[PDB]
Design a protein around this ligand. Structure first.
Ligand SMILES: Nc1nc2c(ncn2[C@@H]2O[C@H](COP(=O)(O)OP(=O)(O)O)[C@@H](O)[C@H]2O)c(=O)[nH]1
Length: 254
């Protein structure tokens, strides 16, 4: 019984440390196809399940311009992982949570690993794990590569949540009447197409001028957008995500 897992996260949040802690010496070097960027893969067993762990290049966000974000995003959207672990810096969680929302809009299964929880405790931070699960709709595990906190529970959660396919997660962030109308237009236009991607996600990246999806959207016959229109959609979407994240932090962090 094999489970394929990807580690996603911003640069310098503690992904490598968590990767090492989970896999030990059972890891291997290789290259991603077509680039020189190192691909790290590791293996660990848990209750007779065998987990293959891929560490993705660090990404502040999941655009499509830098080679690291191309690699990571292509894997997330087009790859074969059964679930993803979003590794977040517990101490300064804002950018990590923004990255998470991006993944949730792709409609992939994700576990939130709030790592460096030892530095959170040390600095007097109070993080409500159940408030996080409530606003994010996914399993949350507090981890520390320094203390070992949560490592085993994360392994348990990986096999448990990989086997839980009856109850699904759904995020729909309301972007306001205007952006929602345009999303509706785009979904209705792609309704009879063979999108290998979530249409709401497709529409969002198209409106905001994503290099991949804006270009593909136009290909499929959607209207071209001015620089001002793309800049404006991108800003509105970003602002709404930031607002949601600020509310999550408000509710879950004391
Ligand atoms: N306090 C604390 N520090 C950590 C933890 N995990 C990683 N670090 C430190 O955070 C820095 C970045 O960690 P690293 O694994 O290289 O992050 P990466 O860039 O995401 O691969 C390093 O200095 C680590 O020593 C943790 O759980 N607790």
């Amino acid at each position: 019984h094999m489970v394929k897992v990807a580690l996603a996260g911003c640069p310098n949040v503690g992904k490598t440390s968590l990767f090492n802690a989970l896999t030990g010496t059972k890891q291997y070097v290789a290259n991603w196809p077509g680039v020189t960027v190192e691909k790290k893969e590791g293996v660990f067993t848990y209750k007779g399940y065998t987990i293959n762990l891929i560490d993705l290049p660090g990404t502040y966000s999941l655009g499509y311009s830098s080679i690291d974000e191309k690699i990571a995003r292509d894997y997330l959207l087009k790859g074969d992982a059964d679930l993803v672990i979003l590794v977040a810096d517990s101490v300064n969680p804002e950018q990590s949570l923004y990255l998470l929302l991006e993944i949730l809009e792709m409609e992939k299964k994700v576990i939130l690993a709030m790592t460096a929880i030892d530095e959170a405790k040390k600095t007097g931070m109070k993080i409500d794990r159940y408030e996080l699960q409530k606003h994010l709709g996914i399993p949350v595990v507090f981890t520390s590569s320094v203390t070992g906190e949560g490592l085993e529970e994360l392994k348990e959660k990986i096999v448990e949540y990989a086997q839980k396919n009856t109850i699904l997660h759904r995020m729909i962030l309301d972007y306001g009447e205007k952006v929602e109308s345009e999303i509706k237009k785009v979904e209705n236009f792609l309704r009879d197409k063979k999108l290998r991607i979530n249409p709401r996600y497709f529409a969002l990246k198209y409106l905001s001028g994503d290099p991949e999806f804006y270009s593909e959207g136009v290909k499929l016959g959607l209207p071209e957008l001015s620089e001002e229109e793309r800049i404006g959609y991108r800003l509105l979407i970003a602002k709404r995500k930031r607002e949601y994240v600020e509310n999550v932090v408000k509710e879950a962090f004391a």
